[PDB]
Design an enzyme around this catalytic site. Structure first.
Site, short mmCIF file in Angstrom:
data_model
loop_
_atom_site.label_atom_id
_atom_site.label_comp_id
_atom_site.label_asym_id
_atom_site.label_seq_id
_atom_site.Cartn_x
_atom_site.Cartn_y
_atom_site.Cartn_z
N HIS A 43 0.81 -1.22 0.00
CA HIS A 43 0.00 0.00 0.00
C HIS A 43 0.84 1.26 0.00
CE1 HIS A 43 -3.45 -2.61 0.72
NE2 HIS A 43 -2.74 -3.15 1.69
N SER A 111 -4.04 -7.69 -1.46
CA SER A 111 -4.87 -6.83 -0.64
C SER A 111 -5.54 -5.78 -1.49
CB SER A 111 -3.99 -6.15 0.37
OG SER A 111 -4.72 -5.50 1.35
N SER A 113 -7.76 -2.57 -1.79
CA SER A 113 -8.19 -1.38 -1.08
C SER A 113 -9.58 -0.98 -1.52
CB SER A 113 -7.21 -0.25 -1.36
OG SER A 113 -7.58 0.95 -0.72
N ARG A 139 -2.45 -11.14 5.44
CA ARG A 139 -3.34 -12.07 4.74
C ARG A 139 -4.26 -12.76 5.74
NH1 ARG A 139 -3.49 -17.44 3.02
NH2 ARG A 139 -1.47 -17.87 4.02
N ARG A 140 -5.56 -12.75 5.46
CA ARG A 140 -6.53 -13.37 6.35
C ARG A 140 -7.43 -14.31 5.55
NH1 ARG A 140 -8.51 -8.26 10.23
NH2 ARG A 140 -6.38 -7.60 10.77
#
Ligand SMILES: O=C(Nc1ccc(-c2nnn[nH]2)cc1Cc1ccccc1)c1cccc(CC2CCCCC2)n1
Length: 190
Positions: A43, A111, A113, A139-140
């Site tokens: 990011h 990821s 956004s 990371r989930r």
């Protein structure tokens, strides 16, 4: 070429105090996204390395396909893959495709956004999504990102994506071309 693929985590205000991971069902109304978003690292906006080719709702979540197109990044990463003991340390010994393995290992997370859910109760005003980042942490729900030289090979590594869904994903990966896209902003620090 270098392509990346995998299931994403959807995050509002990534890396900030107000960071909030979203359930994918909170944004599925706003999928698919066919137009290119920047791909950055962690990011950080000054680390653009490529462009997304599609974000799609599938059974098990939200799948992203991207192209890593920055020549500076590609040259640097390839060189580190072949010469850096640090880069190679956490990867299996003597791989045939060290660049792919190093990316898969060091940047496992995708990821996406998003704007905050409060904007999704109503009709959002502007773009719901901003970019996808390759991430070392966070990371989930997402799966480990797969990097490869062909898009078909990359998507075909996810048994959780049906042949049908694969066809839908790859349909657009082929429609939206890459060569015309602007050069990403990444600058090699070497
Ligand atoms: O701290 C990290 N990297 C880092 C930090 C400072 C400098 C540096 N500063 N000054 N000279 N070199 C150079 C780099 C290498 C770098 C190369 C390509 C893209 C961004 C970063 C870092 C931490 C976690 C994951 C990654 C992703 C890397 C992607 C490419 C293969 C190796 C892993 N990088």
């Amino acid at each position: 070429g270098l392509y990346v693929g995998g299931f994403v985590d959807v995050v509002s205000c990534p890396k900030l105090e107000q960071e909030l991971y979203l359930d994918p069902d909170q944004v599925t109304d706003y999928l698919p996204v066919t137009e290119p978003l920047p791909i950055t690292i962690e990011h950080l906006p000054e680390t653009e390395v490529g462009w997304t080719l599609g974000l799609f709702q599938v059974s098990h979540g939200i799948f992203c396909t991207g192209a890593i197109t920055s020549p500076a990044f590609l040259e640097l990463a390839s060189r580190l893959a072949d010469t850096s003991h640090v880069a190679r340390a956490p990867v299996k010994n003597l791989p045939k495709e060290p660049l792919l393995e190093i990316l898969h290992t060091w940047l496992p997370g995708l990821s996406l956004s998003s704007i905050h859910p409060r904007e999704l109760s109503q009709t959002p005003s502007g773009p719901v999504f901003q970019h996808v980042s390759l991430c070392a942490l966070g990371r989930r729900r997402g799966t480990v990102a797969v990097y490869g030289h062909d898009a078909e090979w990359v998507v075909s590594r996810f048994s959780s994506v049906s042949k049908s869904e694969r066809a839908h994903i790859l349909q657009h990966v082929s429609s939206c071309r890459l060569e015309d896209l602007s050069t990403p902003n990444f600058v090699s620090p070497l």
